[PDB]
Every structure is written in structure tokens, then in C-alpha cells.
């Protein structure tokens, strides 16, 4: 026989609740009933309630088994995750919705919420997309799971209710690889280094292919040292991206006292009302202070609170700034502008600013 390979993921259509399978592509409209609860009405007349819960993303298999029992009891043995790692159950009997929410809350400690309603114009904060950090990654400047936990404990009320005037996405990347959506988020936490690499000549020789390590440096900071068959760093040109360490174990630059997070704001992915946008740095650096990261959490909430207090309905962070300007933004958020925030990343081509980075155009 030989082992089976190249068979792919099980076909989703066979994993769909029968009411979803039946009404596939034949929905009339959705209606956000309450935070965490969305009613979907098919053209057939079928009505399905999709109930959403926040999760820590890292799950115990025993938790998954618990969610399985719950799904068997309330949603006919079917569920899904969302693209922000919330978990959803499908309920046909509206009189059972609350029994479900209470049973999840009680059995696995997951809160109902993470929804928003553009119709009324009232929005929850959903989950934070984040990476592995110290749990599994070899190149992190910050932890991912500890910071998300700390930030969500503080902004918890925003997840369970629809308290914000517009959509706000928060994301975290534990280094400048930015593994997720930090580069296009309303608020983004990004791990950075502040110290250059110290070439370890013996490790570079044994394990590093020099030309491709050299070419990974965005600034030209690295050059080969032919005589000693190694690499030299020009510290004047190094901005601590860590990319040379991804390539080469003989190029570490970690420093637990100077590694930290930058805070970026004003990314947007959707097209609604205004074109997508890359997030922008507004706090250069905050230290790692496990387990609660209070300086970092304090700035994230400061930024979110100032935005929520002055935003009009639908006006996401970048839109708010389109209205008021960066001058008033730094004033209202209590943030200091410094030279760090003046862009100096030279390699990027200006012509990219003239490409249409969006699906908005006229036919």
C-alpha cells in the first residue's frame, strides 16, 4: 500500500450544518441581535443564529473536546472558527441561545461577544491576532500570548458589548517579520530590537551561507570579510531588524533590556468609505515587563480611549486622523513626536505609492 499523501484537507461541504448546506449562497440578510449573536435568514425562510465566543487561540485538546460536547448539545455537532480565532456555534432554536452562552461561559470560561453592528453603528472590539512569542519562536523581541492576555483583561468590556463608534482591530507581532496583520491594523503592537548583532565568527563559518546572509540586510550594513571568511557589520547602518539572525545563527542581536515593542496605528484593510492603509508608528518603544506589561498596556488603552472619545460613528482610527490631522492626534492621545517616527527606510520605491493598493475603482 504505502502511506497516503497528497489528499488535502477534508472537504468543508461535508462538515456544514445541514441548514447551512441547504441554504448555501441563498441568504436574504443577517441581523446582529445582541453582542455575540447574529441571526441569519435564508430565502427558504430558514433562520440560523451564529453565536460567537472569544478564545485564547492556544487551546488544550481537552478544551476542544469540551467545545465538542457543547456543539453536540446545542448546534447539532457543528461549529467553526473565525478569521480572528473566535469560535462560533450555530443554533436553530432561538430559545436555546442563552442556555448555550451560559454553558460555554461556565464550562470553558470563553465570553460571548466579539461582534459589531454597522447598521446601528455600534462596535465591539474583537480578538487580537497574534503570533507565537516565547511559547515557540526563536526570533521574538516580545511575548505574544502574555501581552494579548494583559491587553484583553484591560479592554474586556469592549469585547462583550458594542461600545465603540467604529471598527477597531488590534494585532500583535512578536518581531519585525510581522506574522499576521500588524502591518494593516487600527492599533498594532510590534516587537523590535534596539541593539546591533555581534558576529560570532565560528558559528558564521560553520553554519552561515555568507552571500545570502549579506543580501538579507535591507540597509547594506553587512559586508563579507573574505580574510576571515565571515561577515562584518557597519553599526552606523544597522537598525536592528534582526533579518540577519533569521538567516544566520552567528548573528544574534537580542538584548533583554533593550528589546521591546513599538506601537503603530491607523491601518485599514476593508474598502468601506476609505482606502486601505498601512499602520504607522506612534510610540517608538516600550519595554518588556512580564507578566503584565503595564507600560505597553497603558499606551494601547490611552490611544484607544482618545480615539473612542472623539470618533464619529463609523470613523475608524485612520479616518479620525484624516479628519483632524496628526498634530491634533498626538495632542489628544498625549503622545510625543520624536525623530524616530520620521520615515528613513530607504529601500522602498516611491512608485509603490502610485500603485492602486485597493479594489476601489470605477468601471
Amino acid at each position: 500500500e504505502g502511506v497516503k499523501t497528497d489528499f488535502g484537507p477534508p472537504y468543508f461541504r461535508d462538515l456544514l450544518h445541514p441548514v447551512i448546506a441547504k441554504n448555501y449562497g441563498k441568504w436574504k440578510y443577517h441581523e446582529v441581535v445582541k453582542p455575540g449573536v447574529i441571526k441569519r435568514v435564508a430565502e427558504s425562510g430558514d433562520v440560523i443564529y451564529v453565536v460567537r465566543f472569544g478564545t485564547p487561540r492556544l487551546l488544550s485538546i481537552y478544551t476542544v473536546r469540551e467545545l465538542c460536547d457543547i456543539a453536540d448539545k446545542y448546534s447539532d455537532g457543528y461549529l467553526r472558527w473565525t478569521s480572528r480565532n473566535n469560535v462560533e456555534f450555530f443554533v436553530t432554536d432561538e430559545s436555546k441561545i442563552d442556555d448555550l452562552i451560559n454553558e460555554v461561559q461556565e464550562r470553558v470560561g470563553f465570553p460571548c461577544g466579539g461582534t459589531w453592528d454597522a447598521v446601528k453603528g455600534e462596535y465591539g472590539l474583537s480578538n487580537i491576532v497574534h503570533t507565537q512569542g516565547w511559547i515557540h519562536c526563536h526570533t521574538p523581541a516580545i511575548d505574544a500570548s502574555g501581552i494579548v492576555k494583559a491587553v484583553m483583561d484591560e479592554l474586556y468590556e469592549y469585547f462583550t458589548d458594542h461600545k465603540l463608534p467604529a471598527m477597531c482591530r488590534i494585532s500583535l507581532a512578536c518581531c519585525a517579520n510581522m506574522c499576521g496583520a500588524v502591518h494593516a491594523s487600527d492599533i498594532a503592537i510590534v516587537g523590535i530590537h534596539r541593539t546591533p548583532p555581534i558576529p560570532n565568527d565560528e558559528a558564521i563559518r560553520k553554519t552561515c551561507e555568507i552571500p545570502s546572509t549579506v543580501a538579507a540586510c535591507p540597509t547594506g550594513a553587512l559586508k563579507p570579510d573574505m580574510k576571515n571568511k565571515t561577515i562584518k557589520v557597519d553599526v552606523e547602518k544597522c537598525m536592528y531588524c534582526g533579518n540577519c539572525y533569521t538567516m544566520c545563527p552567528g548573528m544574534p542581536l537580542f538584548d533583554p533590556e533593550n528589546d521591546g515593542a513599538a506601537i503603530m496605528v491607523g491601518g485599514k484593510l476593508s474598502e468601506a468609505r476609505r482606502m486601505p492603509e498601512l499602520s504607522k508608528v506612534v510610540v517608538p518603544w516600550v519595554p518588556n515587563e512580564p507578566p503584565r506589561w503595564p507600560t505597553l498596556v497603558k499606551y494601547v488603552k490611552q490611544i484607544l480611549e482618545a480615539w473612542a472619545a472623539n470618533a464619529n460613528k463609523h470613523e475608524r482610527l485612520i479616518e479620525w486622523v484624516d479628519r483632524i490631522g496628526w498634530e491634533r492626534f498626538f495632542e489628544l492621545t498625549g503622545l510625543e513626536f520624536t525623530q524616530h517616527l520620521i520615515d528613513d527606510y530607504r529601500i522602498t520605491p516611491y512608485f509603490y505609492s502610485e500603485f492602486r493598493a485597493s479594489t476601489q475603482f470605477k468601471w
Partner: protein, 417 residues
Amino acid sequence: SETPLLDELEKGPWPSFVKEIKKTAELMEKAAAEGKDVKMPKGARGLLKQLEISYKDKKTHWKHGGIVSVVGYGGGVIGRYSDLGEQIPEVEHFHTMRINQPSGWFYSTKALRGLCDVWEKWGSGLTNFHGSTGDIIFLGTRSEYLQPCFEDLGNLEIPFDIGGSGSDLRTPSACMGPALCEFACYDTLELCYDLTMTYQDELHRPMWPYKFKIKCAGCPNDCVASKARSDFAIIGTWKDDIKVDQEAVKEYASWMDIENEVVKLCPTGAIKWDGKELTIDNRECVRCMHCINKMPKALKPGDERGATILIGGKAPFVEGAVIGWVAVPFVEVEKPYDEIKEILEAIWDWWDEEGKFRERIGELIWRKGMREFLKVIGREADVRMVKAPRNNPFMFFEKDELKPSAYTEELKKRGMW
């Protein structure tokens, strides 16, 4: 306590990942003590212990990864070794396996339980639902268990294959699309499944200069973040008029401030409401979704549907962060998706031929120019591709666009033509 720093993060209202780790350790040790067939009962607790040392030192305790895979694949498992392997031998090896998810993360309890049964036997019991690219993450097992784990996965009643890693096609992913969403402009789940199965070899066996990610969004709201998080973003759109139910708008008009919340927020002034009738100048609409989002009982995407393809989205390294830009204003999305497959294969052949080591497609297009890229995919230059025409006159001309002259004859005579 053995873990006084992580114990802090069992406090507070948000569900705690530390309780997830502790529950796994407790119950895996309890299953193994009941004689169940569990190979790594101490895996979870050793992760716990190393995490606590990481919180105290404020640094990673993982080292640069050696290479590891399943028999027959060169991607899908990320080797990981602890620099604390002698102090904590139970995490000397702690590889992740990425498991390809069903399109739109739809499961049945039977499917998930098969995964839990196999992972309990072979791994730490820890998972991510889900990895950012879409995959189920099996977090932490040993080199010897990878193959036997994969064999169990493939022998389940509802079997699961490994996902992508390295310089391959990564696991494609999709928004829920038509399964739940009345805005879907094409079958996102079906296109994702079909691309996944069509390109199994490209996924399982990395061969390319670097990675390539595809993401499928049913409409411009882009609920999979395709334009930022995939090189090839397939974004549902339409060509004809938005569908309007006038009675339903009046229903909204009775309570919603349509003027301030819809009319004034349209990027292009395309939509008007005079108290009795709504009008959409569809030639002026850029299909941003805002009015539909606002009035889903009243407004729908038009009937002539397909997608816009945005190319090049990537994180910063090396030449900077990319939100993908218009490559293909409109393509049809119908099974078996030949026009999309044609575009893809053309790009991947070119890119395999010209690409440098670790160059993403975005960077290659920056390097070679849009003219070469458009020839590759056999499409013509369109104004929708730019936000503005060039702000300088340093244009290249094709030799065949030049008027024959003594100078052009001189260039030919010298072999500069």
C-alpha cells in the same frame, strides 16, 4: 508555586492561555497514569516550565531550528529545539505540525475529535485554532513521532493532511463566504478547496524562490485580510448595478440617519437619498461596500460577479510592507477556475525562473516592472492599476515602438538592438 509569573495570567476576566497549558499537563499526565497510550505526557508541563524561565529572563529559550519533515513532504513541520533540553528533557524537541484546515474553518465534532485523539497519542496536547495562515497548529512533538502522527491523521474516518511551510504554496484560506454571508460574490470555500487540491505538490514540496500565499475574500470588506496577508488576493466584486429594494430603504429611512451615515460617507458621492427614492450612480460607485454594509436588507451586490486580483501583499522584509495592488481588475470565478489557474501558473513559472533566493513576487515585480509582469500574465495595462500616472518622464520604450531611423540602423549595425 512553580510558576509564580504565569500564575498572574490566570487572573483577570479574559480566558487564560496559561489555564489552557495547565489543563493539558494535568489531563495528559492523568491519561498516561490511567495507562492510556500517550507518548508525551510531560510535554505540556515542560513547555510551562520553560515559559516561566522565559518570563523571568525576558527572552526566548528556543534555538535556531534543524530541519524535520514527514516522509514524502519537504514542508509543513517547523522543527524546534529548546536551549534548555538538558534541564528540561521533555521539550528537547518541540516541533509544530501545521494541519490543513477545512475551508472557512468549518468543522463537525467528529472531525475535531479525530484530531484530538491523534494529538493526545503523539504530541503535547497543545494546539492553536488557528495559525494565522489558517492551519490548525499541533504545538510540540518529537522527531520520531512526526511520521506515525501523520499516518494516524491520514487513517482517520475524517482524514487531515499536512499544511504548507518553507518556500512553497502556503495553505490557502477563505472567508466564510456563501456558507453564511449574503454579500459573497463568489464561492470562496469552493475556490479555496479547489486551489488546495489542484496544487498539493506545490504545497507539500517547496520548489520556489520563497513562499507564496493565496487568500480568498468573498467581497471587498476582505474579511480574510487577503490584500495584506497573501501574495495573491482574490477579492469578490461585481460589474453591474447594486440591487435596491426601495420599500426596504424607506423602512430604514424611518429610523436611520441615511444622509449622515450613508450619503455623506460614500467615497464618491455615488448614492443619493431625497426622502422618497434612493439613487445610485453605479458608474461613479467604486464598490466599497459601505451602503450595503449599512442597509443589508435593502441593497445587494449586482449580478455580474467575479473578483479583482490584487498582487504582492507581504510583510516588510526585505523591501517594505505591501498591501497588494490591482493586477487583474476583473476575472470570472467559476469552476474549475481555469482563468485563475492560468494566471497563477504563468506567474509561478516566471517567478521560478527570474526570482532571486528569498525574493517574494511583489519584490520581483518591483524589480522587473509591471510591463514584464503584464506580458507574463498576458494582460494589457489598465489605468485601474495605478492611483496616479508616473510623476516623471523616464519611460522605457519597446524597440518596435520606435520610428525606423539612421540612428536605429546604427544600433543594429553595432549589435545594440
